[PDB]
Amino acid sequence: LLSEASVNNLMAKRKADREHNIQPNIQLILRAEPTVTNILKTMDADHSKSPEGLLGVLGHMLSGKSLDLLLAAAAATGKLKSFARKFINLNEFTTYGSEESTKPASVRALLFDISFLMLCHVAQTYGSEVILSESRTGAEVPFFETWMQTCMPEEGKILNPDHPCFRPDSTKVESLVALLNNSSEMKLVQMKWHEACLSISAAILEILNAWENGVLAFESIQKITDNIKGKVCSLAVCAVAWLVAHVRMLGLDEREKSLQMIRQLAGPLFSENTLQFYNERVVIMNSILERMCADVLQQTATQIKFPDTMPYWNLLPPKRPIKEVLTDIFAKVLEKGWVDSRSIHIFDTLLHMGGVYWFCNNLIKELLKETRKEHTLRAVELLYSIFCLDMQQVTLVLLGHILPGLLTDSSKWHSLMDPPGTALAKLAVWCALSSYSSASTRQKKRHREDIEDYISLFPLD
Amino acid sequence: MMDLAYVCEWEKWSKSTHCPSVPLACAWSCRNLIAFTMDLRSDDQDLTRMIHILDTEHPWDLHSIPSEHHEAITCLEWDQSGSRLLSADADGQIKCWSMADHLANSWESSVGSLVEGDPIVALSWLHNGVKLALHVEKSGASSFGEKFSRVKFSPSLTLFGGKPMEGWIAVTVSGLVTVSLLKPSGQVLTSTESLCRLRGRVALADIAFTGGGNIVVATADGSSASPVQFYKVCVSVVSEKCRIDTEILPSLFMRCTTDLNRKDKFPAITHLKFLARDMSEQVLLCASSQTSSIVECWSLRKETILKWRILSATNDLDRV
């Protein structure tokens, strides 16, 4: 894009200005991205279906923030969609399993485990829609996408575990709850990961039934919960997940007893069963279990201490009305002269949960404090982006009930004056054209269920 | 046999148009006093917020009350007697309408309550504990004691004797509840508290008493994916204020969705109520789509200790 002729004198001036072993992430990204591209290419063939070279590569490429090096690059370049697309079929390959001896099947188990760890942070950081393809032909559906819609309780979304998908069978979970009582598994040469994962959700229901019954030895249960974290801790995560689901409809007085298993499931690490690369796997699943169980830990005031990567989560007051804490951030952002990425997630749950007709009514009356045109125009320019967060709805609710509500009475247009009337008229015409031309997953979520009779509201005279 | 009495109609008053219409509610006194309203939108807002009182012998000399409100009235109820009123609406603005000087066309209300930034999803009065039983089987009993005898429900929170206290409670649209009780003196005690840690949208709710001065409430978010939680009210005035303890009842999920045939039909809840006031073991729950409606009755009979169960349903329904 730029010629090198204007580069050289700029180099001279830059050295003049700058004249007046801590490796930065700049070059780290710079030679990370060739590695990102060639790994993204070779996972299509799975190292020509030879897992020993892949195991060596993932052993060498497992330094500090190695997964983050590819996640940031693929999200930045927009190729994270292919990153999620290809590992879905890799999980299709590795959940069923072929005939192997104990160590190639252990490598297959770690193929099931690592790629699970490579994608759960994508779900808990970059959202859920980046994983889902939303188009799969036939009944040969991936296991990971059925897991995707049913496993994790989010901060704004809770599972509804009464579904028949949550309870596939009851004869298999008897074998699941019986084989855990005996000894170590020694069975993963062909065990059908997908069939075990869904049966774990009711095997742990049987476990909590036997625990509340008290007819079993508790140290045997300790042996059980230390057995499931020995070699493959993915089944431990599956045991955590539906326990987290089953917490929710239980009352707060009825929740801490099951946590005795949960605190045993992901407490201190378990030694003497390391296949390979085990210490870092516990650390990388701790961040997954932190956010997946956050909506329980805010309710159940308990500690599990899994081991920060916790950027935007729940700094709100618990009982204060949201009016005053909603209003005061806008003035501080205006006086900053710029908007903070911290406040972007702060306003997000607000505009999620309250209801937009209330939010517009709060801000419109606060628009009527101004006499300086630049001072109100900054607020109008900020409100342009704030309304562009849901432009498709504010282009219909500003013109729908606000503008009729700005003219119905007589004295109410006394506020409509030279700074604010002109500023609001410019604000409307910025949004109107953009809606004629035609930004979050949560906006897609909240726009699904609601239906409204627009003719009943507006019969077009 | 069904009879139609009359229709009393103002001249140049009908055909409301060019306005989003609102569902309306009606109220009736212990006496023969209908309290009603209508949405008009005729160059003023108070016509929607207008109160009409009609004495039962002369439907023309109507008593008119211009109840000024910032939001339109949603639920209208009287007192158990014919002395007090309520015009429920969003963000408080609730008064207490007492009768004025034993006329037929005179009211006043100098007291009330208000809550800021929180619409109200359910509301009810307090309880008196006086009730008798009607026996049509005792037509030939030839005594008023036989045909009419008290069942003696427990009066709610009898302080300074057997007199139950006077007041009302309400559940707001968010995770918040309010209580206001009139003293034996002229003062009023009002309290407001978060109902639990979970503060959230509540599309529908209902409030019903139990024997002993406690109150069971219902919830309905409207997201069609949440459990229908139930909560209990523990009245306790600790020497300056009524500190209320809250706890979660054994709740229920919803039917006509686990059959897996069609589950996103009737996508939003439209009706959630108890069968009758002062009792909370029988729930009407109706979901209406743009075409029809489906209604379910749930019963709190003990087998969980508090489990709800289906009763009956008719052949077909329209939008109720």
Three-state secondary structure readout of chain A: CCCCHHHHHHHHHHHHHHHCCCCCHHHHHHHHHHHHHHHHHHCCCHHHHCHHHHHHHHHHCCCCCHHHHHHHHHHHHCCHHHHHHHHHHHHHHHHHCCCCCHHHHHHHHHHHHHHHHHHHHHHHHCCCCCCCCCCCCCCCCCHHHHHHCCCCCCCCCCCCCCCCCCCCCCCHHHHHHHHCCCCCCCCCCCCCHHHHHHHHHHHHHHHHHHHHHCCCCHHHHHHHHHHCCCCCCHHHHHHHHHHHHHHHHCCHHHCCCCHHHHHHHCCCCCCCCCCCCCHHHHHHHHHHHHHHCHHHHCCCCCCCCCCCCCCCCCCCCCCCCHHHHHHHHHHHHHHHCCCCHHHHHHHHHHHHHCCHHHHHHHHHHHHHHCCCHHHHHHHHHHHHHHHHCCHHHHHHHHHHHHHHHCCCCCHHHHCCCHHHHHHHHHHHHHHHHHHHHCCCHHHHHHCCCCCCCHHHHCCCC
CA distance A216 to A57: 45
Locate breaks in chain A with C to N over 2.5 A; list the residue preceding each.
20, 307, 438
CA distance B162 to B168: 19
Contact criterion met (CB below 8 Å) for B216 and B231: yes
**Tokens 């992430």 sit at which residue?**
A25
**CA-CA-CA-CA torsion for A78, A81, A86, A87, nearest 10 degrees?**
110
CA distance B142 to A169: 65
What is the resolution of the experimental data for this entry, in Å? 8.2
The alpha-carbon gap from A165 to the nearest alpha carbon of chain B, in Å, equals: 10
**Strand, coil or helix: what is B293?**
strand
The alpha-carbon gap from B300 to the nearest alpha carbon of chain A, in Å, equals: 17
Amino acid in the structure at residue A408? T
CB atoms under 10 Å from CB of A295, counted, come to 20
Amino acid in the structure at residue A420? P
Contacts of A160 in chain B (CB under 8 A): 225-226, 253
Long-range CB contacts for residues A330-334, cutoff 8 Å, separation at least 24: A330/A363, A330/A366, A330/A379, A330/A382, A333/A382, A334/A378, A334/A379, A334/A382
Q: Whats the size of chain A, residue-wise?
A: 461
Amino acid in the structure at residue B237? V
- Two structure tokens written together for B45: 């807002």
- With CA atoms as reference, the chain A residue closest to B231 would be A251
Largest CA distance in chain B: 62
Query: Hey, which bits of B194-308 come out as E strands?
Result: 207-209, 215-218, 230-233, 237-238, 241-242, 269-274, 282-288, 293-299
CA distance B47 to A210: 64
CB-nearest partner of B20 from A252, A355, A456: A456
The alpha-carbon gap from B19 to the nearest alpha carbon of chain A, in Å, equals: 6
The alpha-carbon gap from A374 to the nearest alpha carbon of chain B, in Å, equals: 31
Contact criterion met (CB below 8 Å) for A267 and A305: yes
β-partners of residue B94 are B113
Say whether B224 and A449 touch across the interface (CB within 8 A): yes
Contact criterion met (CB below 8 Å) for A267 and A304: yes
Contacts of B253 in chain A (CB under 8 A): 160, 162
CA distance A385 to A343: 13
**At A158, phi and psi to the nearest 5?**
-115, 145
- With CA atoms as reference, the chain A residue closest to B255 would be A162
CA distance A434 to B109: 50
CA distance A90 to A309: 27
**Tokens 């929710």 sit at which residue?**
A248
Closest alpha carbon to A267 in A289, A251, A252, A246: A289
Contacts of B258 in chain A (CB under 8 A): 162-164
CB-nearest partner of A451 from B116, B198, B290: B290
User: What is the CA angle A62-A124-A93, rounded to 5?
Assistant: 60
- Two structure tokens written together for B203: 């599309």
CB-nearest partner of B197 from A299, A449, A458: A299
Contact criterion met (CB below 8 Å) for B218 and B298: no
Which method was used?
Answer: cryo-EM
Long-range CB contacts for residues B56-61, cutoff 8 Å, separation at least 24: B56/B32, B59/B6, B59/B8, B60/B8, B61/B104, B61/B105
CB atoms under 10 Å from CB of B295, counted, come to 16
CA distance A317 to A331: 19
Say whether B290 and A299 touch across the interface (CB within 8 A): no
**Strand, coil or helix: what is B204?**
strand
Residue A126 CA: distances (Å) to CA of A72, A123, A430, B55, B277 = 10, 6, 30, 65, 49
Judged on CB neighbours under 10 Å (0-12, 13-18, 19+), B193 is middle
CA distance B10 to A454: 30
**Strand, coil or helix: what is B107?**
strand
Contact criterion met (CB below 8 Å) for A35 and A78: no
Closest alpha carbon to A164 in B305, B39, B261: B261
Name which of A295, A319, A456 to mutate to probe chain B: the one with the most chain B Cβ atoms within 10 A of its Cβ: A319
CB-nearest partner of A457 from B20, B226, B258: B20
**At B205, phi and psi to the nearest 5?**
-160, 170
- Two structure tokens written together for B94: 């609730």
Q: Whats the size of chain B, residue-wise?
A: 320
Contact criterion met (CB below 8 Å) for A400 and A356: no
Q: Is A351 left (phi over 0), alpha (psi -120 to 50) or beta?
A: alpha
Q: Which residues contact A179 (CB under 8 A, 6 or more apart)?
A: A185
- Two structure tokens written together for A231: 């070699």
**Ordered alpha helix ranges (H), chain B:** 144-147
CA distance A434 to A447: 19
**Strand, coil or helix: what is B147?**
helix
- Two structure tokens written together for B319: 């939008």
- Two structure tokens written together for B25: 């509610």
CB-nearest partner of B197 from A160, A318, A408: A318
Contact criterion met (CB below 8 Å) for B123 and B86: yes
